[PDB]
Symmetry: C2
Subunit: 299 residues, 2 copies
């Protein structure tokens, strides 16, 4: 049971390189529009208190260098949609797949195609943390990297990398320029909130362990929704709602274990530890597997 | 901090995956040029797997008995031959999506990306390492036979693994692209026991060197140990013994830093006897052994 990422083939053909002056980052080429973070028009000295609306007036179409491999894309128009620049190019991308722009909620998972200078280099699976950050691997030049989910024939773009916080975490926006979290696209001291463990994802992971035959944390006891949240709040676990119980329905029928019955096992794990044992070969509880991910990978 | 286990982009490999059907069995195949590669047990039923006579089974088959399907376009099989444990199906049309490719055989401890496919359709990609017992610990359901492992260097794809069998212990076994099995495993439905799995010591040391470069230093100690003494302690924790070749590979890591290889071994020895004590190294609460030294000194 590994953390698999979606195939990146449909996304690799849409990555381009956007250059404005000295700054170079990655862009998303869909149809005849190139999407990239709006701070590409700002120098290192302009990131203190940038005025994007005034800076964009200065720039023209010939100040943007869009490169797709060996070919050069010619910019004929520019626009801004919140914290995202929309560059209109003269040629449509023939590699454009069936796509859709969606905004996800914290706790959901998606695959990230890390790119450098418009060239994909790696792909990995991650989840949106409750503090609206992601524990990704972004170095310098990886701005503009996109996160996506893959339907049967449709690619849902949900994230674009914008900034790197001074803690190893990264922050970004959706494809419409709306930031995930209280962050702003400026070079200043920005603090991420207290990260909490995704309780619903842990329960789904525990169901996956039961499917794989690893059944030792199961106990005869059961708890209430209110009692579990009291323990969950103490151990920095997000509160469990009724909709979370409904989502875990398909996994409850396959294993025969009720959600509240499983919560008693998780409650004992937090208080008494792992008792020197492993679940699915791990000494810690994974919280980056959504209930939908468990169904996809198992049933 | 932060060191993600990243997998190579799979775009160049997605266009080479096909579906091969022989009778009732259906698995995945690799379409390169005018040759389709797939495990040879596709011509075996569930009853023949106990004692398969592949020479007897293959001679009774014809070209029209193999159904090769790349999406909706059906390929025409014009010939076939068997190389060790792999089947080579020659088709009438070459694959226009064929990239610059190579066939390499890897040693235990090396890492590669795996593209999991079901009935010729890719489903997911993950990064793994060849364990010292010549097995891989991934997610392979029924119908994933034929999925390949690869590495990408610049623009060249290096195919190194093809999934063949799933062991009763939950691990998977396979061959290289020439049909030679990794380990003593065979393509039979018999009781095959994998060896004891051990931690890749050289990968852990390379990972620890990346930690001191990135900031973490709490595990360093003032002691040093000999290579012979370290192995006597390492074997007690099911750690692979360290050879002189591993020391030379870690040379550049000890050059950028100030810590000798034997110095780092003493620190690793102290970590094993004490544990993490609630602390983390590069954001990880466990010692990682799936990062090769080559990857460590490229992305420092």
């Amino acid at each position: 049971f590994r953390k698999m990422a979606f195939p990146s083939g449909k996304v690799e053909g849409c990555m381009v390189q956007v250059t404005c002056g000295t700054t170079t980052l990655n862009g998303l080429w869909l149809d005849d529009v190139v999407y990239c973070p709006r701070h590409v028009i700002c120098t290192s000295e302009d990131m203190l208190n940038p005025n994007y609306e005034d800076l964009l007036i200065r720039k023209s179409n010939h100040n943007f260098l869009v490169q797709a491999g060996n070919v050069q894309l010619r910019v004929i128009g520019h626009s801004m949609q919140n914290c995202v620049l929309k560059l209109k190019v003269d040629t449509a991308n023939p590699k454009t797949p069936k796509y859709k722009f969606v905004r996800i909620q914290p706790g959901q998972t998606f695959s990230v195609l890390a790119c450098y200078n418009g060239s994909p280099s790696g792909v990995y699976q991650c989840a949106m943390r409750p503090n609206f950050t992601i524990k990704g691997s972004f170095l310098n030049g990886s701005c503009g990297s996109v996160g996506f989910n893959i339907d049967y024939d449709c690619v849902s773009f949900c994230y674009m990398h914008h900034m790197e916080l001074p803690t190893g975490v990264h922050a970004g926006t959706d494809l419409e320029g709306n930031f995930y979290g209280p962050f702003v696209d400026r070079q200043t001291a920005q603090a991420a909130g207290t990260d909490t463990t995704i309780t619903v994802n842990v329960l789904a992971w525990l169901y996956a362990a039961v499917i794989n035959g690893d059944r030792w944390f199961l106990n005869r006891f059961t708890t209430t929704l209110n009692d579990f949240n009291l323990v969950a709040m103490k151990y920095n676990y997000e509160p469990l709602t009724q909709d979370h119980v409904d989502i875990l329905g398909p996994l409850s029928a396959q294993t025969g274990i009720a959600v509240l019955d499983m919560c008693a096992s998780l409650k004992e794990l937090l208080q008494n530890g792992m008792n020197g044992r492993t679940i699915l070969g791990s000494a810690l509880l994974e919280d980056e597997f959504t209930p939908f991910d468990v169904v996809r990978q198992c049933s």
